[PDB]
């Protein structure tokens, strides 16, 4: 059988033009009174999946 894509991470990651994976920051749901405006302003942008995590999660999104 052909191997299956991790569907839970295909909804979170995007593949860039160089093959890397682009993600979103993760402290942006519901406690905005407890974090300052600089923090909130920087958390709303996108980020990159680091090398250590990419080593681990390559297979899961191979055909995504």
């Amino acid at each position: 059988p052909k191997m299956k894509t991790h569907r839970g991470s295909a909804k979170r990651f995007k593949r860039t033009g160089s093959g890397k994976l682009k993600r979103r920051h993760g402290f942006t749901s519901h406690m905005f009174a407890n974090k300052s405006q600089k923090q909130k302003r920087k958390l709303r942008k996108s980020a990159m999946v680091s090398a250590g995590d990419f080593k681990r999660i390559r297979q899961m999104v191979a055909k995504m």
Binding site: H6, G8, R12, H25, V49, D53, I57
Partner: protein
Amino acid sequence: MKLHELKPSEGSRKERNRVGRGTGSGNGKTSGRGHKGQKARSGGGVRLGFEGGQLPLFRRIPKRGFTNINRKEFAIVNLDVLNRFEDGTEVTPELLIETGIIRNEKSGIKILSDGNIEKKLTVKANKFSAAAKEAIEAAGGKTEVI
């Protein structure tokens, strides 16, 4: 080749490694696996993204976006490809499809503006970029949308 002197290309074939056949090969007793863990057992190992109990990375970042059902994606043609049709020729989607430059028109043909052209052509296309627009009309040609 005489069938008794067959010599395959050098470096194209290697010798398979067999593990667990004595200590002289370096892959003997434990067979490249170490000593007494979960990873030393038959069929043993963790999932692809398991982290031993810590929350996986994908579950501490949020989902984003939706998918459009009516998404339209066009077949992209730059300008330098057009340089190898003789001037005065009517560039039309069927000419492109049978020239082999377009494998399949996904939702139509769009002309982009990479490269330079220098010959008078009249182009038939579904969509144009502005740069490609003045690029075609600066060589005396004309562009009309099908």
